[PDB]
Design an enzyme around this catalytic site. Sequence first.
Site, mmCIF file in Angstrom:
data_model
loop_
_atom_site.group_PDB
_atom_site.id
_atom_site.type_symbol
_atom_site.label_atom_id
_atom_site.label_comp_id
_atom_site.label_asym_id
_atom_site.label_seq_id
_atom_site.Cartn_x
_atom_site.Cartn_y
_atom_site.Cartn_z
ATOM 1 N N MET A 1 -53.018 -36.994 -8.752
ATOM 2 C CA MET A 1 -51.562 -36.462 -8.998
ATOM 3 C C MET A 1 -51.435 -36.472 -10.942
ATOM 4 S SD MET A 1 -50.165 -35.624 -6.132
ATOM 5 C CE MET A 1 -51.798 -35.244 -5.823
ATOM 6 N N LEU B 1 -43.380 -31.374 -11.570
ATOM 7 C CA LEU B 1 -42.911 -32.111 -10.399
ATOM 8 C C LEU B 1 -41.473 -31.934 -9.929
ATOM 9 C CD1 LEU B 1 -43.506 -35.990 -11.862
ATOM 10 C CD2 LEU B 1 -44.391 -35.283 -9.797
ATOM 11 N N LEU C 1 -42.286 -31.085 -2.722
ATOM 12 C CA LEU C 1 -41.856 -32.275 -2.982
ATOM 13 C C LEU C 1 -40.356 -32.579 -2.862
ATOM 14 C CD1 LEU C 1 -42.514 -35.308 -4.096
ATOM 15 C CD2 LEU C 1 -42.865 -34.052 -6.306
ATOM 16 N N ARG D 1 -52.592 -32.835 -10.290
ATOM 17 C CA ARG D 1 -51.449 -31.767 -9.677
ATOM 18 C C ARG D 1 -50.606 -31.641 -10.757
ATOM 19 N NH1 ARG D 1 -48.849 -28.614 -7.826
ATOM 20 N NH2 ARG D 1 -47.875 -28.352 -6.217
ATOM 21 N N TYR D 2 -50.135 -32.442 -11.614
ATOM 22 C CA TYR D 2 -48.878 -31.962 -12.513
ATOM 23 C C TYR D 2 -49.304 -32.254 -13.869
ATOM 24 C CZ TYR D 2 -46.645 -32.727 -7.817
ATOM 25 O OH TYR D 2 -46.211 -32.670 -6.557
ATOM 26 N N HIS E 1 -48.073 -48.126 -3.320
ATOM 27 C CA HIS E 1 -46.743 -47.036 -3.639
ATOM 28 C C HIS E 1 -46.060 -46.850 -2.205
ATOM 29 C CE1 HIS E 1 -44.973 -43.873 -6.254
ATOM 30 N NE2 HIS E 1 -44.176 -43.600 -5.000
ATOM 31 N N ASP F 1 -56.592 -48.251 -13.239
ATOM 32 C CA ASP F 1 -54.995 -48.405 -13.690
ATOM 33 C C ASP F 1 -54.269 -47.310 -13.918
ATOM 34 O OD1 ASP F 1 -54.902 -51.553 -14.145
ATOM 35 O OD2 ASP F 1 -56.523 -51.129 -15.604
ATOM 36 N N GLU G 1 -48.052 -47.701 -12.532
ATOM 37 C CA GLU G 1 -47.529 -48.612 -11.637
ATOM 38 C C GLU G 1 -48.394 -49.841 -11.707
ATOM 39 O OE1 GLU G 1 -45.498 -46.598 -10.314
ATOM 40 O OE2 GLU G 1 -45.801 -45.004 -9.059
ATOM 41 N N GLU H 1 -44.927 -51.206 -14.163
ATOM 42 C CA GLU H 1 -44.441 -52.258 -13.064
ATOM 43 C C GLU H 1 -45.012 -53.381 -12.535
ATOM 44 O OE1 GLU H 1 -42.556 -50.934 -8.651
ATOM 45 O OE2 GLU H 1 -43.902 -49.323 -9.515
HETATM 46 C C1 LIG Z 1 -34.556 -40.355 -9.795
HETATM 47 C C2 LIG Z 1 -34.740 -38.724 -10.172
HETATM 48 C C3 LIG Z 1 -33.764 -38.415 -11.373
HETATM 49 C C4 LIG Z 1 -32.531 -39.022 -11.623
HETATM 50 C C5 LIG Z 1 -31.935 -38.474 -12.820
HETATM 51 O O1 LIG Z 1 -31.213 -37.458 -12.715
HETATM 52 O O2 LIG Z 1 -31.895 -39.348 -13.610
HETATM 53 C C6 LIG Z 1 -34.427 -38.090 -8.844
HETATM 54 C C7 LIG Z 1 -34.185 -36.536 -9.165
HETATM 55 C C8 LIG Z 1 -34.912 -35.808 -7.901
HETATM 56 C C9 LIG Z 1 -35.209 -36.805 -6.562
HETATM 57 C C10 LIG Z 1 -36.075 -36.598 -5.638
HETATM 58 C C11 LIG Z 1 -35.666 -35.764 -4.485
HETATM 59 O O3 LIG Z 1 -34.371 -36.290 -4.211
HETATM 60 C C12 LIG Z 1 -36.649 -35.679 -3.183
HETATM 61 C C13 LIG Z 1 -37.069 -36.863 -2.587
HETATM 62 C C14 LIG Z 1 -36.321 -37.292 -1.596
HETATM 63 C C15 LIG Z 1 -36.166 -38.867 -1.045
HETATM 64 O O4 LIG Z 1 -34.612 -38.721 -0.340
HETATM 65 C C16 LIG Z 1 -36.258 -39.854 -2.193
HETATM 66 C C17 LIG Z 1 -37.371 -39.427 -3.085
HETATM 67 C C18 LIG Z 1 -37.229 -37.877 -3.720
HETATM 68 C C19 LIG Z 1 -38.517 -37.670 -4.583
HETATM 69 C C20 LIG Z 1 -36.007 -38.113 -4.781
HETATM 70 C C21 LIG Z 1 -36.413 -39.298 -5.726
HETATM 71 C C22 LIG Z 1 -35.562 -39.401 -6.968
HETATM 72 O O5 LIG Z 1 -34.159 -40.132 -6.573
HETATM 73 C C23 LIG Z 1 -35.580 -38.145 -7.706
HETATM 74 C C24 LIG Z 1 -37.154 -37.736 -8.289
HETATM 75 C C1 LIG Z 2 -40.519 -39.298 -12.115
HETATM 76 C C2 LIG Z 2 -39.965 -40.143 -10.996
HETATM 77 C C3 LIG Z 2 -39.252 -41.297 -11.554
HETATM 78 C C4 LIG Z 2 -40.018 -42.643 -11.355
HETATM 79 C C5 LIG Z 2 -40.397 -43.691 -12.303
HETATM 80 O O1 LIG Z 2 -39.449 -44.402 -12.488
HETATM 81 O O2 LIG Z 2 -41.570 -43.908 -12.633
HETATM 82 C C6 LIG Z 2 -40.529 -40.076 -9.684
HETATM 83 C C7 LIG Z 2 -39.764 -40.298 -8.492
HETATM 84 C C8 LIG Z 2 -40.459 -39.981 -7.118
HETATM 85 C C9 LIG Z 2 -41.792 -40.128 -7.686
HETATM 86 C C10 LIG Z 2 -42.948 -39.150 -7.018
HETATM 87 C C11 LIG Z 2 -42.910 -39.742 -5.756
HETATM 88 O O3 LIG Z 2 -43.245 -41.132 -5.552
HETATM 89 C C12 LIG Z 2 -43.910 -39.187 -4.987
HETATM 90 C C13 LIG Z 2 -45.357 -38.950 -5.591
HETATM 91 C C14 LIG Z 2 -46.384 -40.402 -5.416
HETATM 92 C C15 LIG Z 2 -47.710 -40.214 -6.400
HETATM 93 O O4 LIG Z 2 -48.300 -41.538 -6.535
HETATM 94 C C16 LIG Z 2 -47.312 -39.555 -7.793
HETATM 95 C C17 LIG Z 2 -46.759 -38.225 -7.625
HETATM 96 C C18 LIG Z 2 -45.369 -38.194 -6.982
HETATM 97 C C19 LIG Z 2 -44.857 -36.930 -6.514
HETATM 98 C C20 LIG Z 2 -44.402 -39.218 -7.842
HETATM 99 C C21 LIG Z 2 -44.134 -38.654 -9.282
HETATM 100 C C22 LIG Z 2 -43.003 -39.424 -9.886
HETATM 101 O O5 LIG Z 2 -43.486 -40.777 -10.385
HETATM 102 C C23 LIG Z 2 -41.572 -39.200 -9.158
HETATM 103 C C24 LIG Z 2 -41.265 -37.785 -9.033
#
Ligand SMILES: C[C@H](CCC(=O)O)[C@H]1CC[C@H]2[C@@H]3[C@H](O)C[C@@H]4C[C@H](O)CC[C@]4(C)[C@H]3C[C@H](O)[C@]12C
Ligand SMILES: C[C@H](CCC(=O)O)[C@H]1CC[C@H]2[C@@H]3[C@H](O)C[C@@H]4C[C@H](O)CC[C@]4(C)[C@H]3C[C@H](O)[C@]12C
Lengths: 359, 359
Positions: free
Chosen positions: B12, B28, B34, B100-101, B199, B276, B279, B283
């Site tokens: 990713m 993303l 996604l 991917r991103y 994860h 590494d 995470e 984390e």
């Molecule tokens: C945490 C983040 C931003 C919050 C903010 O505005 O600061 C939000 C915005 C879009 C969200 C994502 C989208 O809702 C789609 C996914 C749906 C699942 O129910 C949770 C993970 C999921 C991937 C979400 C995780 C996370 O809460 C996201 C990534």
């Molecule tokens: C950026 C946001 C905030 C997370 C944080 O605090 O690190 C998080 C919320 C959900 C996350 C995603 C969801 O966990 C699903 C994916 C997990 C993969 O390990 C990386 C891409 C991946 C698509 C993630 C990218 C990014 O870390 C996301 C979009």
Amino acid sequence: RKPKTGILMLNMGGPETLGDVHDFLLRLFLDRDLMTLPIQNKLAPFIAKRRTPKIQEQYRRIGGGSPIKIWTSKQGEGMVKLLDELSPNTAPHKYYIGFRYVHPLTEEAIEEMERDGLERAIAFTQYPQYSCSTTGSSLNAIYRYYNQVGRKPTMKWSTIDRWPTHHLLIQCFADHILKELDHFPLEKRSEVVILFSAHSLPMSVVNRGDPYPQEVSATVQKVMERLEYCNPYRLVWQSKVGPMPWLGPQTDESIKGLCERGRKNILLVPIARTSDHIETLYELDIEYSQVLAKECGVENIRRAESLNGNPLFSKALADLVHSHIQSNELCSKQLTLSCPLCVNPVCRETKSFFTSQQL
Amino acid sequence: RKPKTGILMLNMGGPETLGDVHDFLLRLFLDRDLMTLPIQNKLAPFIAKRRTPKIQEQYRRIGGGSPIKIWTSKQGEGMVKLLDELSPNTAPHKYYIGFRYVHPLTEEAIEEMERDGLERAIAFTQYPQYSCSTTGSSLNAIYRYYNQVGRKPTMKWSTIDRWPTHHLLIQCFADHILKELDHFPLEKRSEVVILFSAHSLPMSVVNRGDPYPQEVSATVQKVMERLEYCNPYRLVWQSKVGPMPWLGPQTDESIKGLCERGRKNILLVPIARTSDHIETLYELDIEYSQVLAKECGVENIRRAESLNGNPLFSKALADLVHSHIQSNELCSKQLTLSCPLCVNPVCRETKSFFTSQQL
Ligand SMILES: C[C@H](CCC(=O)O)[C@H]1CC[C@H]2[C@@H]3[C@H](O)C[C@@H]4C[C@H](O)CC[C@]4(C)[C@H]3C[C@H](O)[C@]12C
Ligand SMILES: C[C@H](CCC(=O)O)[C@H]1CC[C@H]2[C@@H]3[C@H](O)C[C@@H]4C[C@H](O)CC[C@]4(C)[C@H]3C[C@H](O)[C@]12C
Ligand SMILES: C[C@H](CCC(=O)O)[C@H]1CC[C@H]2[C@@H]3[C@H](O)C[C@@H]4C[C@H](O)CC[C@]4(C)[C@H]3C[C@H](O)[C@]12C
Ligand SMILES: C[C@H](CCC(=O)O)[C@H]1CC[C@H]2[C@@H]3[C@H](O)C[C@@H]4C[C@H](O)CC[C@]4(C)[C@H]3C[C@H](O)[C@]12C
Ligand SMILES: C[C@H](CCC(=O)O)[C@H]1CC[C@H]2[C@@H]3[C@H](O)C[C@@H]4C[C@H](O)CC[C@]4(C)[C@H]3C[C@H](O)[C@]12C
Ligand SMILES: C[C@H](CCC(=O)O)[C@H]1CC[C@H]2[C@@H]3[C@H](O)C[C@@H]4C[C@H](O)CC[C@]4(C)[C@H]3C[C@H](O)[C@]12C
Ligand code: FES
Ligand code: FES
Ligand SMILES: [Cl-]
Ligand SMILES: [Cl-]
């Protein structure tokens, strides 16, 4: 000669006739490990009375009661016959059934084992993959029996508390899957998708740490390895009840979803039990394979035969017991770690019951 | 004949510098498979701008950027050297990175592979355990690339789409665990509890059928078998964000729970990563092993080294690619089964892309 080594086969059990349904449910709702109801001594009999007609109807639909005891007996007989030859220094062996919620109850079996003056008692769970709600609850009953009778054991105890990947268990499952793949039309064999189905857990139980989903996943992968990945699969989960969240995907939704997606040739495989059970004969075979599958327009749905009286499975039981005896182990290394968010004080006491045994 | 066989290493990705964070988030949040957002083309840039400072701060805490590209490059170089000797008929081999991103993007790497005029292109995921959200998203980008550019590929494609139990992967993890158990105080080694941490996924994804939890469970059991069950373990799950239910137990809650229950010597094992990553370095190492752990009075908490530059891991990558070439397979049997409750029409298209390839 008098028996020397007792093998306590542990299982939840099920009601043998319709008449046994009510007290099976009552013993279950009284089990403070399994559930905390308010005013539980009053609510348990009321819930047993309410739920009994529905459960008796399910057992009616499969012929009038549970086959667990028959199959458990046949497998225990087979296991003892082998162990008397495999392990002459610990013979004669005798098997005992300890069901958690029907007779013979775990406590009745321990009483007979002590009466018989055995030198050693092995608590042998009949669930290959450990959940605290299944094997843990049967082991807690052993600890609680001695704690409540206020005496120490007169026998040396140890447990075979899980066996999710024993090579002969995996061989039995693989053999029954290949036998069932041979009964599909030959032109659909390679199109068959395998759903391994296991009883689900509520997520409150998954999230506290229960070992069971990762162990059932292990059993799945070793079976598919032995089958050389010949068909594609998913592991899904059955038997959810009530409105709370449980581990999915659900087996019913998955059958219907696959059918809706053009995968209409499906093989169900009951991966977490060793004999037929209301789960297989009613829920998979009637609710899902007859009714649900018919509604969705399945072409072929079949279910792998339960291990039941396969002699190879008696041979597995015996080899497990023989390895356990020769290893001197008292329990698995995994039983020495309670769930990270365990909130039940008895789990520690039961773990210590086993790890602390003289020998 | 120039480079002949391209190995497209898929991951990713993560931002290499703090300046790359905003556009990583933007891609993303634009990715409709996604996440589906109201008025997504306006909201995505806004959420990217809003969350950039916090994500930049996490990367600043680990030195200013993600190390994924450096490690993937070193692993890819090691793999290519071995493949040229193992497989002279398919040499020269060249690796390409497709993130991917972040750059190089999957689409950019495909453009170069086609520019290079390769005969054969292998989509080699660097996640050993398949999730539709990781490897499936990378494979959908390969399909969508050709569908968009409206040209057919000019090279023969196939994919190694998962490898959760590869014997050399298992050996690497076991080796890194045992060497970490050597760093504990010798008087606590036996006491150490292992938390394999991967994860997490939202329950909505698990319940539609994602293959990932069962495959990571399989990697855990093969590693524990190789280690002869020397210590007790649980598989737990990290990185949940937001208020929706995700698969647990959570790694953080599990570390705090074990401490509160007296198990104060813990080894963390990142079982679903090959290098590494934020995470591990932020984390696990900072949020959990420094702040959380000090607060509940852990005695010793360590983390097994990531596979990173271990030469046996480059050996594994080459053995996977050499076996894949020799087998002539185009993808795993499991990729031919989409999730039972898949609702994304592209999954079937990408599956067909791979299964239908010429050769
Ligand atoms: C945490 C983040 C931003 C919050 C903010 O505005 O600061 C939000 C915005 C879009 C969200 C994502 C989208 O809702 C789609 C996914 C749906 C699942 O129910 C949770 C993970 C999921 C991937 C979400 C995780 C996370 O809460 C996201 C990534
Ligand atoms: C950026 C946001 C905030 C997370 C944080 O605090 O690190 C998080 C919320 C959900 C996350 C995603 C969801 O966990 C699903 C994916 C997990 C993969 O390990 C990386 C891409 C991946 C698509 C993630 C990218 C990014 O870390 C996301 C979009
Ligand atoms: C509140 C409690 C939840 C226990 C728990 O926290 O798990 C639940 C579990 C079983 C429930 C009971 C049983 O389902 C039987 C009854 C069902 C009726 O519809 C409501 C009252 C009734 C008597 C329930 C009251 C309450 O919702 C109970 C007691
Ligand atoms: C029989 C009763 C009612 C369900 C039904 O209508 O079939 C069901 C509801 C929830 C069940 C319990 C839940 O499934 C949680 C447990 C999970 C274990 O794998 C079996 C025992 C276990 C403790 C169950 C035994 C029993 O069959 C229960 C109590
Ligand atoms: C289905 C049955 C209610 C029957 C009724 O009176 O209508 C109730 C009684 C007690 C319930 C159980 C108890 O509430 C304890 C467990 C609570 C978990 O939240 C879900 C499963 C769990 C095991 C419950 C499943 C199911 O809803 C049970 C078994
Ligand atoms: C409702 C929707 C969930 C879509 C989904 O289920 O995937 C969520 C996901 C991310 C959310 C947005 C982001 O968190 C950013 C903003 C945060 C503010 O707290 C509210 C508005 C705000 C603009 C959010 C509105 C809404 O609650 C969003 C759009
Ligand atoms: S609930 Fe699992 S050990 Fe107590
Ligand atoms: S979401 Fe898993 S195959 Fe489509
Ligand atoms: Cl039954
Ligand atoms: Cl990263």
